[PDB]
Short mmCIF file of C-alpha atoms in Angstrom, two decimals:
data_model
loop_
_atom_site.label_atom_id
_atom_site.label_comp_id
_atom_site.label_asym_id
_atom_site.label_seq_id
_atom_site.Cartn_x
_atom_site.Cartn_y
_atom_site.Cartn_z
CA UNK A 1 -81.85 1.79 -25.18
CA UNK A 2 -79.53 -1.04 -26.18
CA UNK A 3 -76.11 -2.44 -25.39
CA UNK A 4 -73.43 -4.86 -26.51
CA UNK A 5 -72.13 -7.59 -24.21
CA UNK A 6 -68.35 -7.84 -23.77
CA UNK A 7 -66.26 -10.66 -22.33
CA UNK A 8 -65.43 -10.77 -18.65
CA UNK A 9 -61.99 -10.68 -17.06
CA UNK A 10 -59.96 -12.57 -14.47
CA UNK A 11 -57.80 -10.73 -11.98
CA UNK A 12 -57.17 -9.53 -8.46
CA UNK A 13 -56.00 -6.38 -6.66
CA UNK A 14 -53.69 -6.12 -3.65
CA UNK A 15 -52.79 -3.28 -1.33
CA UNK A 16 -49.87 -2.93 1.05
CA UNK A 17 -49.19 -0.29 3.66
CA UNK A 18 -45.53 0.68 3.88
CA UNK A 19 -44.15 2.50 6.94
CA UNK A 20 -40.82 4.20 7.57
CA UNK A 21 -40.54 5.60 4.06
CA UNK A 22 -41.94 8.22 1.67
CA UNK A 23 -43.81 8.07 -1.60
CA UNK A 24 -40.80 9.70 -3.32
CA UNK A 25 -38.41 7.05 -2.04
CA UNK A 26 -40.75 4.24 -3.08
CA UNK A 27 -41.33 5.84 -6.49
CA UNK A 28 -37.61 6.21 -7.22
CA UNK A 29 -37.53 2.39 -7.34
CA UNK A 30 -41.05 1.41 -8.41
CA UNK A 31 -41.53 4.23 -10.93
CA UNK A 32 -38.37 3.51 -12.94
CA UNK A 33 -40.37 1.16 -15.13
CA UNK A 34 -37.71 0.25 -17.68
CA UNK A 35 -35.20 -0.54 -14.90
CA UNK A 36 -37.30 -3.10 -13.01
CA UNK A 37 -34.03 -5.01 -12.60
CA UNK A 38 -33.19 -2.38 -9.97
CA UNK A 39 -36.40 -3.25 -8.13
CA UNK A 40 -37.28 -6.97 -8.33
CA UNK A 41 -33.59 -7.84 -8.41
CA UNK A 42 -34.00 -11.35 -6.97
CA UNK A 43 -35.99 -12.34 -10.07
CA UNK A 44 -34.93 -9.94 -12.84
CA UNK A 45 -31.33 -10.03 -14.05
CA UNK A 46 -31.42 -7.06 -16.43
CA UNK A 47 -33.82 -4.66 -18.15
CA UNK A 48 -33.77 -1.98 -20.83
CA UNK A 49 -36.06 -0.01 -23.10
CA UNK A 50 -36.37 -1.47 -26.62
CA UNK A 51 -39.07 0.78 -28.15
CA UNK A 52 -39.87 4.42 -27.50
CA UNK A 53 -38.30 6.58 -24.81
CA UNK A 54 -37.51 5.28 -21.31
CA UNK A 55 -40.53 5.42 -18.98
CA UNK A 56 -42.75 7.33 -21.39
CA UNK A 57 -46.21 6.04 -22.24
CA UNK A 58 -46.09 3.63 -25.14
CA UNK A 59 -42.53 2.51 -24.51
CA UNK A 60 -41.57 -1.16 -24.34
CA UNK A 61 -39.16 -2.69 -21.84
CA UNK A 62 -37.37 -5.98 -22.34
CA UNK A 63 -36.21 -7.72 -19.19
CA UNK A 64 -34.39 -10.96 -18.54
CA UNK A 65 -35.15 -13.29 -15.65
CA UNK A 66 -32.81 -15.64 -13.83
CA UNK A 67 -33.27 -19.35 -14.62
CA UNK A 68 -36.00 -21.15 -12.69
CA UNK A 69 -33.53 -23.94 -11.96
CA UNK A 70 -29.99 -25.13 -12.73
CA UNK A 71 -30.28 -26.38 -16.31
CA UNK A 72 -33.01 -24.04 -17.55
CA UNK A 73 -32.48 -20.96 -19.72
CA UNK A 74 -33.11 -17.34 -18.79
CA UNK A 75 -36.58 -16.21 -19.89
CA UNK A 76 -37.59 -12.87 -21.35
CA UNK A 77 -40.46 -10.42 -20.84
CA UNK A 78 -41.55 -7.68 -23.22
CA UNK A 79 -44.01 -5.24 -21.68
CA UNK A 80 -45.50 -1.97 -22.87
CA UNK A 81 -46.23 1.02 -20.64
CA UNK A 82 -49.81 1.87 -21.63
CA UNK A 83 -50.38 4.63 -19.09
CA UNK A 84 -48.00 6.72 -17.02
CA UNK A 85 -48.67 9.58 -14.65
CA UNK A 86 -45.50 10.17 -12.65
CA UNK A 87 -46.91 13.19 -10.84
CA UNK A 88 -49.73 10.98 -9.55
CA UNK A 89 -47.37 8.01 -8.93
CA UNK A 90 -49.39 5.59 -11.03
CA UNK A 91 -48.92 3.59 -14.19
CA UNK A 92 -50.20 0.63 -16.16
CA UNK A 93 -48.48 -1.96 -18.36
CA UNK A 94 -49.20 -5.06 -20.40
CA UNK A 95 -47.09 -8.01 -21.40
CA UNK A 96 -46.76 -7.89 -25.18
CA UNK A 97 -44.24 -10.69 -25.77
CA UNK A 98 -41.65 -13.05 -24.35
CA UNK A 99 -41.50 -16.45 -22.68
CA UNK A 100 -41.35 -15.37 -19.04
CA UNK A 101 -42.42 -18.33 -16.94
CA UNK A 102 -46.11 -18.37 -16.07
CA UNK A 103 -46.70 -14.75 -17.03
CA UNK A 104 -46.32 -15.44 -20.76
CA UNK A 105 -49.12 -18.04 -20.51
CA UNK A 106 -51.77 -15.47 -19.70
CA UNK A 107 -53.87 -13.77 -22.35
CA UNK A 108 -53.45 -9.99 -22.30
CA UNK A 109 -51.99 -9.67 -18.82
CA UNK A 110 -52.46 -6.05 -17.73
CA UNK A 111 -51.12 -4.63 -14.45
CA UNK A 112 -51.77 -1.37 -12.55
CA UNK A 113 -49.56 0.21 -9.91
CA UNK A 114 -50.65 3.19 -7.82
CA UNK A 115 -48.94 4.83 -4.82
CA UNK A 116 -50.76 7.02 -2.28
CA UNK A 117 -49.61 8.97 0.79
CA UNK A 118 -51.47 8.49 4.09
CA UNK A 119 -52.10 11.70 6.06
CA UNK A 120 -49.04 12.94 7.94
CA UNK A 121 -51.16 13.48 11.06
CA UNK A 122 -51.95 9.76 11.01
CA UNK A 123 -48.24 8.92 10.88
CA UNK A 124 -47.83 8.99 7.12
CA UNK A 125 -46.76 5.92 5.20
CA UNK A 126 -47.49 4.79 1.65
CA UNK A 127 -50.35 2.71 0.26
CA UNK A 128 -49.05 0.56 -2.58
CA UNK A 129 -51.87 -0.68 -4.86
CA UNK A 130 -51.07 -3.40 -7.41
CA UNK A 131 -53.65 -5.19 -9.53
CA UNK A 132 -53.73 -7.39 -12.60
CA UNK A 133 -56.26 -8.64 -15.09
CA UNK A 134 -56.15 -11.31 -17.74
CA UNK A 135 -58.58 -12.63 -20.32
CA UNK A 136 -60.07 -16.09 -19.73
CA UNK A 137 -58.38 -18.78 -21.80
CA UNK A 138 -58.73 -22.56 -21.99
CA UNK A 139 -55.24 -23.38 -20.83
CA UNK A 140 -55.56 -21.54 -17.52
CA UNK A 141 -57.99 -20.70 -14.71
CA UNK A 142 -58.37 -17.57 -12.63
CA UNK A 143 -56.91 -19.49 -9.70
CA UNK A 144 -53.87 -20.55 -11.69
CA UNK A 145 -53.33 -16.90 -12.67
CA UNK A 146 -53.49 -15.78 -9.07
CA UNK A 147 -50.99 -18.51 -8.18
CA UNK A 148 -48.62 -17.11 -10.81
CA UNK A 149 -48.96 -13.42 -10.02
CA UNK A 150 -49.31 -13.06 -6.26
CA UNK A 151 -46.06 -14.82 -5.33
CA UNK A 152 -44.17 -12.46 -7.64
CA UNK A 153 -45.87 -9.36 -6.23
CA UNK A 154 -44.97 -10.68 -2.78
CA UNK A 155 -41.34 -11.17 -3.82
CA UNK A 156 -41.35 -7.66 -5.35
CA UNK A 157 -42.49 -6.05 -2.09
CA UNK A 158 -39.75 -7.96 -0.26
CA UNK A 159 -37.17 -6.74 -2.80
CA UNK A 160 -38.49 -3.18 -2.44
CA UNK A 161 -37.64 -3.30 1.27
CA UNK A 162 -34.14 -4.45 0.51
CA UNK A 163 -33.55 -1.55 -1.87
CA UNK A 164 -35.04 0.92 0.61
CA UNK A 165 -32.90 -0.53 3.41
CA UNK A 166 -35.95 -0.91 5.62
CA UNK A 167 -36.98 -4.14 7.40
CA UNK A 168 -39.71 -6.33 5.90
CA UNK A 169 -41.82 -5.50 8.95
CA UNK A 170 -42.25 -2.09 7.26
CA UNK A 171 -44.64 -3.72 4.78
CA UNK A 172 -48.13 -5.01 5.64
CA UNK A 173 -50.47 -6.64 3.14
CA UNK A 174 -53.89 -5.10 3.82
CA UNK A 175 -56.86 -7.42 4.60
CA UNK A 176 -54.86 -10.44 5.73
CA UNK B 1 -37.92 -12.20 -29.05
CA UNK B 2 -40.65 -10.11 -30.58
CA UNK B 3 -43.64 -8.18 -29.34
CA UNK B 4 -46.90 -6.67 -30.55
CA UNK B 5 -47.33 -2.95 -29.98
CA UNK B 6 -50.69 -1.62 -28.97
CA UNK B 7 -52.39 1.66 -28.16
CA UNK B 8 -52.14 3.58 -24.93
CA UNK B 9 -54.95 4.41 -22.50
CA UNK B 10 -56.27 7.46 -20.74
CA UNK B 11 -57.31 7.31 -17.10
CA UNK B 12 -56.64 8.08 -13.47
CA UNK B 13 -56.90 6.37 -10.09
CA UNK B 14 -58.09 7.96 -6.84
CA UNK B 15 -57.89 6.73 -3.23
CA UNK B 16 -59.80 8.00 -0.19
CA UNK B 17 -59.40 7.21 3.49
CA UNK B 18 -62.75 6.73 5.20
CA UNK B 19 -62.99 6.74 8.99
CA UNK B 20 -65.83 5.96 11.37
CA UNK B 21 -67.16 2.97 9.48
CA UNK B 22 -66.26 -0.59 8.50
CA UNK B 23 -65.43 -2.21 5.18
CA UNK B 24 -68.56 -4.33 5.53
CA UNK B 25 -70.79 -1.32 5.98
CA UNK B 26 -69.18 0.48 3.05
CA UNK B 27 -69.53 -2.65 0.89
CA UNK B 28 -73.24 -3.00 1.68
CA UNK B 29 -73.73 0.20 -0.34
CA UNK B 30 -70.87 0.24 -2.84
CA UNK B 31 -70.92 -3.49 -3.55
CA UNK B 32 -74.58 -3.70 -4.54
CA UNK B 33 -73.67 -3.08 -8.17
CA UNK B 34 -77.11 -3.33 -9.74
CA UNK B 35 -78.68 -1.03 -7.12
CA UNK B 36 -76.42 1.98 -7.59
CA UNK B 37 -79.58 4.07 -7.01
CA UNK B 38 -79.16 3.18 -3.31
CA UNK B 39 -75.69 4.72 -3.39
CA UNK B 40 -75.19 7.70 -5.72
CA UNK B 41 -78.68 9.00 -5.07
CA UNK B 42 -77.69 12.60 -5.88
CA UNK B 43 -77.40 11.48 -9.49
CA UNK B 44 -79.12 8.16 -10.08
CA UNK B 45 -82.91 7.89 -9.97
CA UNK B 46 -83.41 4.15 -10.54
CA UNK B 47 -81.37 1.06 -11.33
CA UNK B 48 -82.12 -2.56 -12.25
CA UNK B 49 -80.34 -5.62 -13.55
CA UNK B 50 -81.34 -6.18 -17.18
CA UNK B 51 -79.08 -9.07 -18.17
CA UNK B 52 -77.71 -12.00 -16.18
CA UNK B 53 -77.99 -12.61 -12.45
CA UNK B 54 -77.78 -9.59 -10.14
CA UNK B 55 -74.19 -8.70 -9.14
CA UNK B 56 -72.71 -11.74 -10.85
CA UNK B 57 -69.88 -11.19 -13.31
CA UNK B 58 -71.22 -10.68 -16.81
CA UNK B 59 -74.43 -9.04 -15.63
CA UNK B 60 -75.65 -5.72 -17.02
CA UNK B 61 -77.30 -2.93 -15.06
CA UNK B 62 -79.46 -0.18 -16.51
CA UNK B 63 -79.77 2.98 -14.51
CA UNK B 64 -81.52 6.29 -15.05
CA UNK B 65 -79.96 9.62 -14.16
CA UNK B 66 -81.82 12.77 -13.19
CA UNK B 67 -81.61 15.68 -15.66
CA UNK B 68 -77.93 16.72 -15.66
CA UNK B 69 -78.99 20.35 -15.56
CA UNK B 70 -82.28 22.12 -15.62
CA UNK B 71 -84.36 21.97 -18.79
CA UNK B 72 -82.52 18.83 -19.90
CA UNK B 73 -83.92 15.29 -19.98
CA UNK B 74 -83.12 12.10 -18.07
CA UNK B 75 -80.29 9.95 -19.40
CA UNK B 76 -79.61 6.20 -19.23
CA UNK B 77 -76.49 4.12 -18.49
CA UNK B 78 -75.98 0.47 -19.40
CA UNK B 79 -72.91 -1.01 -17.76
CA UNK B 80 -71.58 -4.53 -17.54
CA UNK B 81 -69.93 -6.10 -14.51
CA UNK B 82 -66.77 -7.61 -15.94
CA UNK B 83 -65.15 -8.78 -12.72
CA UNK B 84 -66.43 -9.36 -9.22
CA UNK B 85 -64.83 -10.62 -6.04
CA UNK B 86 -67.15 -9.80 -3.17
CA UNK B 87 -65.11 -11.44 -0.41
CA UNK B 88 -62.15 -9.34 -1.54
CA UNK B 89 -64.38 -6.26 -1.89
CA UNK B 90 -63.42 -5.41 -5.46
CA UNK B 91 -65.05 -5.24 -8.84
CA UNK B 92 -64.72 -3.82 -12.34
CA UNK B 93 -67.34 -2.57 -14.79
CA UNK B 94 -67.64 -0.91 -18.15
CA UNK B 95 -70.25 1.21 -19.90
CA UNK B 96 -71.81 -0.71 -22.79
CA UNK B 97 -74.67 1.55 -23.81
CA UNK B 98 -76.87 4.53 -23.10
CA UNK B 99 -76.61 8.27 -23.40
CA UNK B 100 -75.56 9.10 -19.85
CA UNK B 101 -74.26 12.67 -19.75
CA UNK B 102 -70.51 12.86 -20.18
CA UNK B 103 -69.74 9.23 -19.48
CA UNK B 104 -71.31 8.09 -22.76
CA UNK B 105 -68.86 10.29 -24.71
CA UNK B 106 -65.88 8.15 -23.74
CA UNK B 107 -64.74 5.12 -25.68
CA UNK B 108 -64.66 1.91 -23.58
CA UNK B 109 -64.98 3.52 -20.17
CA UNK B 110 -63.80 0.91 -17.63
CA UNK B 111 -63.87 1.48 -13.89
CA UNK B 112 -62.36 -0.36 -10.93
CA UNK B 113 -63.44 -0.22 -7.31
CA UNK B 114 -61.40 -1.73 -4.49
CA UNK B 115 -61.89 -1.54 -0.71
CA UNK B 116 -59.17 -2.31 1.86
CA UNK B 117 -59.04 -2.11 5.67
CA UNK B 118 -56.27 -0.24 7.48
CA UNK B 119 -54.75 -2.18 10.42
CA UNK B 120 -56.85 -2.17 13.61
CA UNK B 121 -53.62 -1.32 15.45
CA UNK B 122 -53.52 2.02 13.59
CA UNK B 123 -57.14 2.93 14.22
CA UNK B 124 -58.69 1.04 11.33
CA UNK B 125 -60.49 2.90 8.59
CA UNK B 126 -61.20 1.95 4.99
CA UNK B 127 -59.20 2.73 1.87
CA UNK B 128 -61.50 3.32 -1.11
CA UNK B 129 -59.70 2.91 -4.44
CA UNK B 130 -61.53 4.04 -7.60
CA UNK B 131 -59.97 4.21 -11.06
CA UNK B 132 -61.07 4.52 -14.66
CA UNK B 133 -59.58 4.08 -18.09
CA UNK B 134 -60.84 5.14 -21.51
CA UNK B 135 -59.45 4.68 -24.99
CA UNK B 136 -58.06 7.83 -26.64
CA UNK B 137 -60.41 9.19 -29.27
CA UNK B 138 -60.31 12.16 -31.61
CA UNK B 139 -63.52 13.70 -30.23
CA UNK B 140 -62.21 13.90 -26.69
CA UNK B 141 -59.17 14.63 -24.52
CA UNK B 142 -57.83 13.00 -21.36
CA UNK B 143 -58.41 16.23 -19.43
CA UNK B 144 -62.06 16.20 -20.51
CA UNK B 145 -62.34 12.61 -19.26
CA UNK B 146 -61.02 13.60 -15.84
CA UNK B 147 -63.38 16.59 -15.72
CA UNK B 148 -66.30 14.22 -16.36
CA UNK B 149 -65.29 11.46 -13.98
CA UNK B 150 -63.78 13.06 -10.89
CA UNK B 151 -66.75 15.24 -9.89
CA UNK B 152 -68.98 12.19 -10.13
CA UNK B 153 -66.65 10.11 -7.93
CA UNK B 154 -66.50 13.03 -5.51
CA UNK B 155 -70.29 13.21 -5.34
CA UNK B 156 -70.54 9.45 -4.89
CA UNK B 157 -68.24 9.61 -1.85
CA UNK B 158 -70.43 12.36 -0.41
CA UNK B 159 -73.56 10.26 -1.06
CA UNK B 160 -71.88 7.28 0.57
CA UNK B 161 -71.52 9.24 3.79
CA UNK B 162 -75.21 10.17 3.67
CA UNK B 163 -76.28 6.54 3.37
CA UNK B 164 -73.83 5.36 6.05
CA UNK B 165 -75.06 8.19 8.28
CA UNK B 166 -71.52 9.35 8.96
CA UNK B 167 -70.26 12.94 8.67
CA UNK B 168 -68.84 14.13 5.36
CA UNK B 169 -65.62 14.84 7.28
CA UNK B 170 -65.13 11.04 7.41
CA UNK B 171 -63.74 11.06 3.87
CA UNK B 172 -60.26 12.23 2.91
CA UNK B 173 -58.85 12.17 -0.60
CA UNK B 174 -55.29 10.87 -0.38
CA UNK B 175 -52.38 12.74 -1.98
CA UNK B 176 -51.07 10.84 -5.00
#
């Protein structure tokens, strides 16, 4: 009959419905974790595994981002796959190093991706769930975190469409 | 150009499509965190906030479960709300004490609940996302975790239908 308090988290979860595609086609892009450069290609210049085996739980990817502006340098993200279930089209990762703009400011940024198939009778389509959390820290606010993360997720869904060769109208952010 | 490796997690995420209701109606039951007795009433006997303000992040609920099987005694769960966004219909909690059957065996059980609306154009409906993680521990296995958690989530979705007064056929587990 007792308990220990723990700290609270910041974060937010988003869900998109994607039509005119299949969970397999989405996964072939989204699920290739260590090759995120082949997904969010407008932002990420290159990516490769630097610890462990490609796309296996525990592995670490290093990816390089294009400069934010003309004179600036490319920035780098190191992120560890901390859960992977390919059969269930879901995984989870955390940033464990790097100087990637905005994202490297957050304390223990953790992200979850999950894909689901809608019933074929209802027309099919994929539900793309993407969430993040971060630990509260003095140099940020929850709002500032949201302002860092959501525009990238939005860009990523746009880039997904490009790689699927489907129009952007195929993607709808739920509850907007 | 360095990173800090950390441990991996166990867990799984589930999504259901729920028809014949609204996200607001669903949330009136699922979103009342400290009164889970008004939701999973097949399992939970009573529930009350015991730390902080009801349903505010950081608060702790204590709830009592009926005897897991016959002959056995009641068990207790203490869980802390570690993130809450009511307008976005999502929250996160973790077990911080008690001897609740099964769930108290896991190390740092964390659960996420997220509700989304399907487009009105497509008939509406609610997507119910529910995930957990736990930290790997020698005394357990990931399969055991899933055997503990999934039947409870399943029962909770059944109980939800009861309290919404909609048929059990309203709920469909989505293929992952």
